[PDB]
Design a protein around this ligand. Structure first.
Ligand SMILES: CC(=O)N[C@@H]1[C@@H](O)[C@H](O)[C@@H](CO)O[C@H]1O
Ligand SMILES: *[C@@H]1O[C@H](CO)[C@@H](O)[C@H](O)[C@H]1NC(C)=O
Ligand SMILES: *[C@@H]1O[C@H](CO)[C@@H](O)[C@H](O)[C@H]1NC(C)=O
Ligand SMILES: *[C@@H]1O[C@H](CO)[C@@H](O)[C@H](O)[C@H]1NC(C)=O
Lengths: 173, 314, 400
């Protein structure tokens, strides 16, 4: 029987200890299974918790460059919230939308010289050549302030002709 | 890893009613083992889905392959339909060589749709660079995209545009060198092989355990049913079932430990997609030796292969 | 009753979440059990003892030893030509299931009236003076009238039986002494006369003998066991293929389906084992045909439910089972029953496997990978966003 009281109350020492020994082998097996499984999980949960600590540390106390680490899109921030037995991060991210094409050119030929966006991209709506920034359409006249020259334009593959505004000369005039 | 399920009843008894009544009388260990076996499979399906299914739109490479000299016929889907796998991928797949209640379940994602995922990913990288990972894909001539990468690395665009042939020659040659190395040199997929080995060998054990006497008169429970009468029959059977139950439980635990290891490796692989492939990584040596430029994903029997471009001064 | 209930119990909850649950396992069972032992050839010479023309006297009972053969006692027992069948120690039947080291056949001839004394615990002239047997012997006594073979006109006096002797005879004792029996005046000293009588007398069988006095042939078969050499009889059965069958090939017992095999066994090889020493093929000894053994199908039942909440309609998936052996639709994961095949392609709802999924009537399709869109690539074209969106997601992570 599985009740060790009925085995104490039904049998005398020798076969009592026999049956009890069997129960104790079985129970000891079961405990030891349990404790091991609990272990394996505790290792899993410890891994998950140190991932969560990393997520605090980087997403919440700072802005993460790690793509999709702190949510889909370009991370902006995250807020932590408690849960019964874990944490919930609400992550703000910035997601571009409402696309629009543009013809591009790696550089611009002007005065026989190649110009290269200092930070941005050369784009044309249909006829006119603006230099924008990559993640938001904000076109803006091409200027020596916002382009940098590097050599002639016999070597760049795909360069395009255009005029690079020089924002002195009208100041001289 | 291989998704295995084990019928505890049959594997312990194997069509023996009296062994069955003994083991049900022994407790409910079969549930736990089964249901961990499940957990561990559905966790395998979840590694794959995570690592590969990052993009929800299947991008198609143009019919016209004008990428500024860069040649990616070797990684791009083969129209010849060798399962729609790139010649790298065929190479990787053919470089790895793959009854008692132990079955094998099939993976949810077939090799064909994994290859298709990698193809969408790789095409979205060639067309759009990293902006297919932040939202909607935006085209870019890929010469500019490589100028932007260079910019990121800490090189000016003129270095690329002046040098564009040389860089293209160079990246072709490196792809060809990967092609020979994976074609002739062996032991290149040692990790995936080791995983397959270590699983296959746990099974060959647990099977080979299934034929041990554990103190009984014999290891075939039929000869003990056919040679003995109930009382000592159940005795010997009880011993067999203690031994077999021990062996299963060992197995299932070891499989667990591994499944945790593989889950760690898979989430590392998902991070590597997410950052190296859908973007340019600042993390030094994370996406290869040198200044990361990009990475391309390729499928494998039971893992992923990242080909990472990096820029190395000289 | 039905799969949805079976699932309900498997989960111990009356409310089922939408998904697939693995409830039970379906097994095939053996039918038409078969046993096959080799083509037919080493039988014990019982006929050489029974049909034997010459038998010795009762006091000179002849003993023979039998070993290293196969004895078929069924023919002897079911003969109807013997009037004496007394097996002690073992049942007269079911003798084909017993194997012993040796068999001792003690044959002799007596008259019918004396057939009674041959049994344990009995006393009599023949038993005490001619042939005494052990009290606790394990064997069988056979005997039959032999009038036509032992009766001769004018008296067949070749048969002799001892009358007078002093002691008793001990078990398994053969005495041939012919010394004149002494009845007492002085020792005979090889001289007869008063109180000196010849120990043995002749039966003198005649054709007109009475039933009691008619001759009877008696043979006692004693089985000695202490490696057994003489075992039981090989009615093998017929071979059936392409069905789950419980088979026994020369002691090798198993369950499975036997099919024609292309494997070529060597002349001295009987059965072939696959890796892990599991039996894979067997050569049937009767005709030396090599047959591949395959475990007759079995595999898991998974139950696909859209949720009790939504509908009580269910689907079974028999896993890695060819369900010709059971809207049946075949997939690389097994077969699905109860779920209509469609060619469409949606997002995966309930994952079945091998690239098929189910969804709610319950429809089984081939999951779609997602909206397939080709990017309008051109070597001088870029796409730039003109708006943005502030997206807030939630990531939950267990800590403790
Ligand atoms: C997956 C599979 O084997 N499907 C089989 C098919 O090949 C075979 O022609 C038929 C005969 O039973 O049954 C079904
Ligand atoms: C770019 O593409 C057009 C057609 O798509 C092709 O004719 C042209 O030669 C290519 N050259 C450059 C510099 O983009
Ligand atoms: C299931 O049925 C209950 C019954 O009260 C209903 O109230 C609940 O909304 C349903 N749940 C789902 C998930 O549909
Ligand atoms: C799907 O349905 C039928 C067969 O069941 C087939 O005739 C039809 O053309 C298929 N539709 C496809 C492949 O789009």
């Amino acid at each position: 029987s599985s009740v060790l009281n009925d085995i104490l109350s039904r049998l005398d020492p020798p076969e009592a200890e026999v049956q009890i020994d069997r129960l104790i082998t079985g129970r000891l097996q079961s405990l030891q299974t349990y404790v091991t499984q609990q272990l394996i999980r505790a290792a899993e949960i410890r891994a998950s918790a140190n991932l969560a600590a990393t997520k605090m540390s980087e997403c919440v106390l700072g802005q993460s460059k790690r793509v999709d680490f702190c949510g889909k899109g370009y991370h902006l921030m995250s807020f932590p919230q408690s849960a019964p037995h874990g944490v919930v991060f609400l992550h703000v991210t910035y997601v571009p939308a409402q696309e629009k094409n543009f013809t591009t050119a790696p550089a611009i030929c002007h005065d026989g010289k190649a110009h290269f966006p200092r930070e941005g991209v050369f784009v044309s709506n249909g006829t006119h050549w603006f230099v924008t920034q990559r993640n938001f359409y904000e076109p803006q006249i091409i200027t020596t302030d916002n382009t940098f020259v590097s050599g002639n334009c016999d070597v760049v593959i795909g360069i395009v002709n255009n005029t690079v505004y020089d924002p002195l000369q009208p100041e001289l005039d | 890893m291989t998704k295995t399920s084990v019928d505890c009843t049959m594997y312990i008894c194997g069509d023996s009613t009296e062994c069955s009544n003994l083991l049900l009388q022994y407790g409910s260990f079969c549930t736990q083992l089964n249901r961990a076996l499940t957990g561990i499979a559905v966790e395998q399906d979840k590694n794959t889905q995570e690592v590969f299914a990052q993009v929800k739109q299947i991008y198609k490479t143009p019919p016209i392959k004008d990428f500024g000299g860069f040649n990616f016929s070797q990684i791009l889907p083969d129209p010849s339909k060798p399962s729609k796998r790139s010649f790298i991928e065929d190479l990787l797949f053919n470089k790895v060589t793959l009854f008692n209640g132990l079955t094998v379940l099939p993976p949810l994602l077939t090799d064909e749709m994994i290859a298709q995922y990698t193809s969408a990913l790789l095409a979205g990288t060639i067309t759009s660079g990293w902006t297919f990972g932040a939202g909607a894909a935006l085209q870019i001539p890929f010469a500019m995209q490589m100028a932007y990468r260079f910019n990121g690395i800490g090189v000016t665009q003129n270095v690329l545009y002046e040098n564009q042939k040389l860089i293209a020659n160079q990246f072709n040659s490196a792809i060809g060198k990967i092609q020979d190395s994976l074609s002739s040199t062996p032991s290149a997929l040692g990790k995936l092989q080791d995983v397959v080995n270590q699983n296959a060998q746990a099974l060959n054990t647990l099977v080979k355990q299934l034929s041990s006497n554990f103190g009984a008169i014999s290891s075939v429970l039929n000869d003990i049913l056919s040679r003995l009468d109930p009382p000592e029959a159940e005795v010997q059977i009880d011993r067999l079932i203690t031994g077999r139950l021990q062996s299963l439980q060992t197995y299932v635990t070891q499989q667990l430990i591994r499944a945790a290891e593989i889950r760690a490796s898979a989430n590392l692989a998902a991070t590597k997609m997410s950052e190296c492939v859908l973007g340019q990584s600042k993390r030094v040596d994370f996406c290869g030796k040198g200044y990361h430029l990009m990475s391309f994903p390729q499928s494998a029997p039971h893992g992923v292969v990242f080909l990472h471009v990096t820029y190395v001064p000289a | 009753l039905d799969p949805l209930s079976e699932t309900k119990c498997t989960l111990k909850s009356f409310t089922v979440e939408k998904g697939i649950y693995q409830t039970s396992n379906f097994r095939v069972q053996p039918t038409e059990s078969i046993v096959r032992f080799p083509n037919i050839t080493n039988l014990c010479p019982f006929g050489e003892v029974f049909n034997a023309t010459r038998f010795a006297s009762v006091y000179a009972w002849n003993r023979k030893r039998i070993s290293n053969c196969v004895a078929d006692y069924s023919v002897l027992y079911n003969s109807a030509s013997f009037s004496t069948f007394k097996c002690y120690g073992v049942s007269p039947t079911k003798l084909n299931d017993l194997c012993f080291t040796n068999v001792y056949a003690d044959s002799f001839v007596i008259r019918g009236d004396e057939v009674r004394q041959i049994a344990p615990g009995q006393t009599g002239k023949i038993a005490d003076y001619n042939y005494k047997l052990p009290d606790d012997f394990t064997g069988c006594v056979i005997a039959w009238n032999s009038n036509n073979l032992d009766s001769k006109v004018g008296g067949n006096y070749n048969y002799l039986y001892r009358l007078f002797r002093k002691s008793n005879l001990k078990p398994f004792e053969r005495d041939i002494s012919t010394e004149i029996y002494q009845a007492g005046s002085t020792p005979c000293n090889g001289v007869e006369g008063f109180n000196c009588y010849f120990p043995l007398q002749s039966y003198g069988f005649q054709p007109t003998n009475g039933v009691g006095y008619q001759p009877y042939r008696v043979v006692v078969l004693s089985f000695e066991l202490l490696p057994a050499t003489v075992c039981g009889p090989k009615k093998s059965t017929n071979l059936v293929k392409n069905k789950c069958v419980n088979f026994n090939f020369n002691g090798l017992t198993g369950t499975g389906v036997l099919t024609e095999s292309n494997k070529k066994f060597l002349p001295f090889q009987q059965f072939g084992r696959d890796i892990a020493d599991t039996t894979d093929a067997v050569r049937d000894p009767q005709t030396l045909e090599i047959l591949d053994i395959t475990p007759c199908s079995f595999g898991g039942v998974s139950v696909i439910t859209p949720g009790t909440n939504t509908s009580n309609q269910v689907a079974v998936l028999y896993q890695d089972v060819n369900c010709t052996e059971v809207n049946v639709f075949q997939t690389r994961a097994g077969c699905l029953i109860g779920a209509e095949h469609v060619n469409n392609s949606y997002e995966c709802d309930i994952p079945i496997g091998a690239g098929i999924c189910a969804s709610y009537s319950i429809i089984a399709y081939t999951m779609s990978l997602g909206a397939e869109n080709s990017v309008a690539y051109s070597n001088n074209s870029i796409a730039i966003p003109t708006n943005f969106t502030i997206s807030v997601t939630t990531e939950i992570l267990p800590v403790s």
